[PDB]
Design a protein around this nucleic acid. Structure first.
Ligand SMILES: [Mg+2]
Ligand SMILES: [Zn+2]
Ligand SMILES: [Zn+2]
Lengths: 65, 1200, 49, 50, 48, 49
RNA sequence: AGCGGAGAGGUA
DNA sequence: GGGCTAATGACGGCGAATACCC
DNA sequence: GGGTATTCGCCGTGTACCTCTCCTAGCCC
């Protein structure tokens, strides 16, 4: 959790970003790298997923719906 | 009764609003509220289960009993909606409208509301300009009212009617008060009162006039009416909110509101029957008096009438109090997905995981088990899945093990006075009936293992699970919220093993050899060829951080070399080279958290607890009756004290000394005897074992169980050891007197009955003391939480360059708080260093090497933010060593950290330490003298006070005198509430030359002459002393009366920052006399919350004698002086309020009516017609929205 | 809880006025019995105590 | 009196004897106090609270 | 969601047993009880 | 297996004397059982009592 | 068949 | 037996009315 | 009219949990 507090300064923004990534992963999607929240935190700490990419995936899922 | 088709549809209510408006209710609006009128006081008819028509429980007024059903049964279908039956008139609708619809009562005579009359700020008394006793006599039918405002006895009314021949009208009762409230105007009376306000010259009459002006202004700008205070139409509660409870045998439980409603309806029907009969005036007067008394018992029972062995509840008692509808159902709610069990200790667990029973986790994780059983295909429906769960095969255990793997649970202690009372753990399935817990967790929980129960909760949403993983995990909460020390400390059984392993002996087997590395030491110890306590010079390789590796040879112990296998590469060997004690391992854990990180400290603490248990099991430490030694010196000093007390008894009986001085000499020589016996016992316990090395007996420290358990830590101190070896000394009585004879026997020998009587007396006194301490600590914690709850870190930078001067606190003895503790944790204001830079331990070490005395700091008492605290003015966080995040509620943490140790609370200037003496504010002719000293490092250890005319004798050594001669928790509660003392110190009002007194007219007068300004006279009582010289000069803020000063005259005279400095100094003095360590940011934000209100004296937009907020007055002043004005803003002074008055004086009527005096805040919000903007933390809990602190700040940013 | 009165006298033995005939619940032959007797060792054992 | 009743049988005087560990078979460093204590059971069960 | 709301606990339970994640919060019913108890004291309390 | 750390904190040492007296009582009971196990005389039991 | 107001005892 | 039937063993802090001679 | 001096009330005084009993019953037949 130290790397997750290293890639972003604020903690609540990290919580909201991991919540959005876990909501995207729970509906069924391929991850960047077993629980959805733990995989979201591992994808955050590996500097693979960004908030802009999360918003792009959410916009693609809203357009596909 | 039962309905399943309507139950499936959801999202019917949006529940989206912005504000909450509370005001009065007109009788036409109350008539538009209800749906029917009740007329009979009959709820349920006898010998049948059917409601009574036009009663308290009726179907024509509120709603049907059964769902989609009438009373007769003509309509028994769900398709019929909005149709009223013909025989019994009710709507065929849902049965949930009985909880929403309400009724009303048409009263034959108007009555007065008791919330506008019986309150001490009476509104009808201020609006009609009448006293309370006159309206109390008029409303209770004892006198008359002319219609200009004077009282009339019935005999005087008869003489007035005979003299006026029945021409002037005069009425009695509430109808005359209603006519008086109807025929008054709000505009012309306001202009008349403003005309009288410019001609008055009195003090209290001006206060009455501006109170009447404020009441008329509130009645004008609220949109209400003065005649709406009397109640013509009385609304009733819905019957589903006040249900009847049945008992066995057909009986029903008694109710409180139903009996009052039946009494009101019965007296109203009796009044209607007496009015239709055309009764005389006495009978209808008594009936109206009984109607007023029943309305008073219905609204607020127990105030004036107290209608009944036990008084029943009413509408006023159902809101206020602890058992009301506000504290039992809104703040604290019963939750599901939760349970409790007893706790045991689990040494095999990790820090982030805990134990959980199998059936308990099966009951808690039942919906996830049902969902996984539906997904796996083992059951088509949930009924077969539930039967497979209750059958308890192996597949449900596989499902329960697969579900609980990555799902955290919230473990909670039943008292939650700590910030860390709720922690998140990853549970495992154990074969038991208790909840296993890690031993490093119960220190922060303050939980024992004898009958302790802990309630668990499971988060089920994804956001709640991620919040519990991020900011509630036990591995993330290492540091304490009060101080910088970590809350995880190794307890007694592991520091006992560490102290047994780290000690060294003189002569042991296997010493004097050289080993290669740590693995050779382990291989030599595991083959039983070398003892654990042996001075063996080993060679270890450690890297040094700035990472360069190095090797060296150190002369250590075998146990200290075995301890080096668990230390990481970052920690140096200078910390683990000494003997392991409680403070040594505490500062070692602190250094490992400071210079290495987070997870390495967690795994190091886990390995440390493991090796502590492993080397405390192999030690076999046991206490017995042979470990406690009894000296002959104890008997020697006992016979010496017996001879000396016989000598002083003969000297007292001879007639040379009195009884009290002899008794004081007796208790002093017995205290000296007990001190000498305790010193001899500590000398014969701690220095008992003498070892022989190389044929010579060299003295070393003894290895006894009691001495090791006293020296290691996390056990009893030396006061507990001296009660077992030597005598326990004198005993204290609760009246204040010490007993003349002590207890000259420990627990190892026998105790007499007269000593055991004093022992159980002291035990009962201590038990009552800690009971009242726990109660007062809980009350102070609740008050401090409700005071400081609006401060939220909103912005990152403000731009305030005010600052605060930090000085080390010396109170005439040992230091209270040094510079390295008070400075560390905040940014600086002025260059001492670079401004707006967070200070670390390296900066504190650099400032200590530079020998700095005072540095300007940025505190929260001087901030320029709008409804919040800046992130830079607060400094660093207490749980994490970095900067405080945006959105952290720093008020609740501060109040909880102040409320931590409340259950644990309770001439000659000769220097003690050496160092150079430097005078401060000296000229001996000096008003305020400080005899501060400077040590070699540059810190101030001693600081003594110097009176007027102190002769100083003086690179000054210790043991000399520079100036020779010149002839608990209620304290913290009185500091926070700022109560006036019994003897208040009168300070100087103005800075001028002191003059002689005036003529004495019962009180002393003191005038201070100025250059151009006139002298000001201050009255003082002649009972107290006074020290004013004739030919002397008095500076600003000097104290002319010796006594305890109040916060008010300290705040209003010289400034704000010395007031906060004095408050922080006194609170830290109390908390360091206790022994605990609490940071000063909590006291600073409490002082900032206490200074929220401001008082103006002459303004153009607002009034001249009203209080307002600081930031609101500032934004109104800048909006006034920004455009088309030059002399707009006014000068104001800061005012102080206590903790009981700061939370009540709030524009939010929900949070102000939350803890104390609900009726006063409710009637104030009803009269003024306030609007709650929901800009708080508790009102978002009451309404049900998100908390505007932490993860909910983005929702409040996107909402507005 | 369960209460029980088990007898303790035998067949054909003389007694006096005041002797017990049946031990009551949590009661010995004439002494009060609350618990059992078992070996105690005062030592830390792997953190389980 | 307690020391005399201890010394009447084949028991040590101080009441502390050296016992071995059952897990590894090794001997402890010190002697512990071994004896019989009248230990009872309370009514606060684990089934009533869980 | 867990304690006070009538429809909220049913929606959360069916979202748990269905697999989807859509949390819709609402006002507690005890707040409506407090509003109906304040309105019985002839004091108008409106949710603007 | 009890914990000896509670003894200096709670400041009671009557349990240690109770442990020693129970150890002496169990030793006396074992000696009486060893005396009555073999064929012993009445005078040895009389002088032991 | 579910919704409760007092009184008493006990644990942390 | 049966079915309706309307006490005076607390304690502390605090804002507001009386009493009254100058 | 206007300052002390008592004085009558108003309002508050820790949390969590586990067992048990008893609930308006009175009367002229
Ligand atoms: Mg306990
Ligand atoms: Zn009908
Ligand atoms: Zn600021």
């Amino acid at each position: 959790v130290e790397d997750c507090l290293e890639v972003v300064n604020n903690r609540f923004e990290l919580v909201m970003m991991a919540s959005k990534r876990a909501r995207q992963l729970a509906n069924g999607v391929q991850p960047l790298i077993d629980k959805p929240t733990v995989m979201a935190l591992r994808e955050i700490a590996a500097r693979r997923i960004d908030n802009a990419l999360i918003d792009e995936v959410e916009k693609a899922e809203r357009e596909r719906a | 009764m039962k309905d399943l088709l309507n139950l499936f549809n959801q999202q019917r209510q949006t529940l989206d609003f912005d504000a909450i408006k509370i005001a009065l209710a007109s009788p036409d609006l109350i008539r538009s509220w209800s749906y029917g009128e009740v007329k009979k006081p009959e709820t349920i008819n006898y010998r049948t289960f059917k409601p009574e028509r036009d009663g308290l429980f009726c179907a024509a007024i509120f709603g049907p009993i059964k769902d989609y059903e009438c009373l007769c049964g003509k309509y028994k279908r769900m398709k019929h909606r909005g149709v009223v039956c013909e025989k019994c008139g009710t709507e065929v609708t849902l049965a949930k409208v009985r909880r929403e619809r309400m009724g009303h009562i048409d009263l034959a005579s108007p009555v007065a509301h008791i919330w506008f009359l019986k309150s001490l700020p009476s509104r009808i008394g201020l609006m009609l300009d009448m006293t309370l006793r006159d309206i109390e006599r008029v409303l209770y039918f004892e006198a008359y009212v002319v219609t200009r405002r004077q009282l009339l006895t019935e005999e005087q009314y008869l003489t007035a009617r005979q003299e006026y021949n029945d021409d002037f009208d005069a009425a009695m009762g509430a109808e005359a008060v209603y006519e008086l409230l109807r025929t008054i105007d709000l505009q012309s009376e306001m202009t008349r009162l403003r005309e009288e306000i410019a001609s008055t010259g009195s003090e209290t009459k001006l206060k009455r006039l501006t109170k009447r002006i404020k009441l008329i202004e509130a009645f004008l700008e609220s949109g209400n009416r003065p005649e709406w205070m009397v109640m013509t139409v009385l609304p009733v509660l819905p019957p589903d909110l006040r249900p009847l409870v049945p008992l066995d045998g057909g009986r029903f439980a008694t109710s409180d509101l139903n009996d009052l409603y039946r009494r009101v309806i019965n007296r109203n029907n009796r009044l209607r029957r007496l009015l239709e009969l055309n009764a005389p005036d006495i009978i209808v007067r008594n009936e109206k008096r009984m109607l007023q008394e029943s309305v008073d018992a219905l609204l607020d029972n127990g105030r004036r009438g107290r209608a009944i062995k036990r008084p029943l509840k009413s509408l006023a008692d159902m809101i206020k109090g602890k058992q009301g509808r506000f504290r039992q159902n809104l703040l604290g709610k019963r939750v599901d997905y939760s349970g409790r069990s007893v706790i045991t200790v689990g040494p095999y667990l990790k820090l982030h995981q805990c134990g959980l029973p199998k059936k308990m986790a099966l009951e808690l994780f039942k919906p996830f088990v049902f969902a996984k059983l539906q997904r796996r295909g083992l059951a088509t429906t949930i009924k077969a899945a539930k039967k497979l769960v209750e059958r308890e095969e192996a597949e449900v255990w596989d499902i329960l093990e697969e579900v609980i793997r990555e799902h955290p649970v919230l473990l909670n202690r039943a008292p939650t006075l700590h910030r860390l009372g709720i922690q998140a753990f990853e549970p495992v399935l154990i074969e038991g009936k208790a909840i296993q817990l890690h031993p490093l967790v119960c220190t922060a929980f303050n939980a024992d293992f004898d009958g302790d129960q802990m309630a668990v909760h499971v988060p089920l949403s994804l956001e709640a699970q991620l919040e519990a993983r991020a900011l509630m995990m036990s591995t993330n909460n290492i540091l304490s919220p009060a101080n910088g020390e970590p809350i995880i400390v190794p307890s007694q059984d592991v520091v006992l093993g560490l102290y047994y392993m780290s000690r060294a002996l003189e002569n042991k087997k296997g010493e004097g050899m050289v080993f290669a590395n740590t693995s050779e030491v382990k291989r030599a110890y595991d083959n039983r060829v070398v003892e654990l306590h042996a001075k063996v010079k080993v060679r270890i390789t450690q890297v040094d951080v700035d990472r360069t590796s190095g090797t060296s040879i150190v002369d250590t112990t075998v146990g200290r070399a075995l301890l080096s296998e668990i230390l990481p590469e970052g920690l140096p060997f200078q910390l683990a080279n000494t003997e392991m004690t409680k403070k040594n391992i505490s500062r070692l854990i602190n250094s490992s958290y400071r210079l290495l990180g987070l997870k390495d400290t967690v795994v190091f603490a886990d390995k440390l607890m493991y090796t502590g248990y492993a080397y405390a099991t192999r030690a076999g430490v046991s206490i017995g009756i042979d470990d406690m030694l009894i000296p002959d010196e104890k008997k020697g000093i006992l016979t010496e004290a017996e001879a000396e007390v016989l000598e002083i008894q003969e000297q007292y009986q001879s007639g040379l000394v009195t009884a009290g001085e002899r008794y004081n000499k007796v208790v002093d020589i017995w205290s000296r005897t007990s001190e000498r016996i305790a010193k001899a016992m500590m000398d014969t316990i701690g220095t008992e074992k003498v070892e022989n090395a190389k044929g010579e007996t060299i003295d070393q420290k003894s290895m006894n169980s009691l001495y090791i358990m006293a020296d290691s830590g996390a056990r009893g101190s030396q006061a507990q050891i001296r009660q077992l070896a030597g005598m326990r000394g004198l005993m204290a009585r609760p009246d204040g007197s010490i007993i003349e004879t002590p207890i000259k026997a420990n627990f190892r020998e026998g105790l007499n009955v007269q000593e055991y009587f004093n022992s159980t007396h002291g035990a009962r006194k201590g038990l009552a003391d800690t009971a009242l301490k726990t109660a007062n600590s809980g009350y102070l914690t609740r008050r401090l939480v409700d005071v400081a709850q609006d401060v939220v870190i909103t912005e990152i930078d403000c731009g305030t360059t005010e600052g605060l001067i930090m000085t080390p606190i010396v109170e005439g003895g040992d230091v209270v708080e040094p510079l390295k503790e008070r400075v560390l944790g905040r940014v600086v204001a002025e260059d001492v260093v670079t401004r707006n830079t967070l200070l670390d331990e390296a900066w504190v070490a650099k400032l200590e090497d530079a020998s700095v005395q005072s540095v300007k700091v940025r505190s929260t008492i001087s901030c320029e933010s709008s409804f919040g605290v800046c992130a830079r003015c607060y400094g660093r966080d207490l749980a994490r060593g970095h900067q405080v995040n945006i959105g952290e509620a720093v008020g609740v943490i501060a109040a909880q950290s102040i409320g931590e140790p409340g259950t644990q609370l309770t001439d000659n200037i000769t220097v003690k330490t050496t160092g150079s003496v430097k005078f401060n504010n000296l000229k001996a002719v000096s008003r305020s003298g400080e005899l501060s000293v400077l040590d070699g490092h540059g810190r101030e250890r001693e600081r003594y006070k110097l009176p007027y005319g102190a002769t100083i004798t003086a690179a000054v050594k210790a043991g000399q005198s520079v100036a020779n001669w010149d002839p608990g928790l209620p304290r913290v509660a009185d500091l926070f509430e700022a109560r006036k003392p019994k003897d208040p110190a009168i300070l100087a009002e103005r800075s001028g030359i002191i003059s002689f007194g005036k003529d004495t007219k019962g009180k002393q007068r003191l005038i201070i002459k100025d250059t151009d300004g006139s002298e000001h006279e201050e009255l003082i009582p002649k009972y107290r002393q006074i020290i004013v010289f004739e030919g002397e000069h008095v500076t600003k803020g000097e104290t002319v009366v010796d006594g305890e000063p109040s916060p008010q005259d300290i705040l209003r005279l010289l400034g704000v920052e010395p007031l906060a400095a004095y408050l922080v100094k006194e609170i830290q003095d109390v908390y360091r006399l206790q022994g605990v360590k609490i940071n000063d940011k909590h006291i600073e934000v409490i002082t900032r919350q206490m200074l929220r209100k401001v008082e103006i004296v002459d303004q153009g937009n607002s009034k001249f004698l009203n209080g307002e907020q600081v930031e609101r007055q500032r934004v109104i002043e800048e909006n006034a002086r920004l455009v088309k004005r030059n002399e707009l803003p006014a000068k104001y002074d800061p005012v102080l309020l206590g903790i009981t008055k700061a939370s009540l004086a709030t524009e939010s009527f929900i949070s102000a009516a939350s803890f104390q005096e609900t009726t006063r805040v409710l009637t104030e919000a009803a009269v003024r017609g306030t609007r709650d903007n929901l800009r708080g933390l508790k009102e978002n809990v009451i309404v049900g929205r998100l908390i505007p602190a932490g993860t909910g700040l983005a929702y409040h940013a996107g909402r507005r | 809880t369960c209460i029980n009165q088990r007898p303790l006298v035998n067949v054909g033995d003389v007694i006096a006025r005041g002797d017990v005939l049946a031990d009551g619940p949590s009661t010995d032959i004439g002494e009060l019995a609350l618990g059992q007797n078992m070996l105690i060792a005062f030592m830390p054992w792997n953190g389980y105590n | 009196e307690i020391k005399r009743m201890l010394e009447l049988a084949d028991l040590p005087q101080s009441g502390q004897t050296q016992l071995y560990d059952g897990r590894t078979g090794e001997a402890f460093d010190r002697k512990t106090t071994v004896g019989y204590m009248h230990y009872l059971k309370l009514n606060h069960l684990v089934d009533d609270k869980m | 969601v867990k304690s006070d709301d009538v429809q909220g606990r049913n929606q959360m339970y069916k979202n748990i047993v269905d697999g989807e994640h859509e949390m819709v919060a609402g006002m507690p019913e005890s707040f409506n009880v407090l509003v109906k108890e304040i309105r019985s004291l002839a004091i108008h309390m409106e949710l603007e | 297996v009890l914990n000896p750390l509670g003894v200096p904190s709670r400041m009671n040492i009557g349990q240690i004397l109770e442990v020693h007296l129970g150890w002496a009582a169990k030793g006396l009971g074992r000696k009486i059982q060893r005396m009555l196990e073999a064929q012993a005389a009445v005078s040895e039991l009389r002088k032991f009592l």
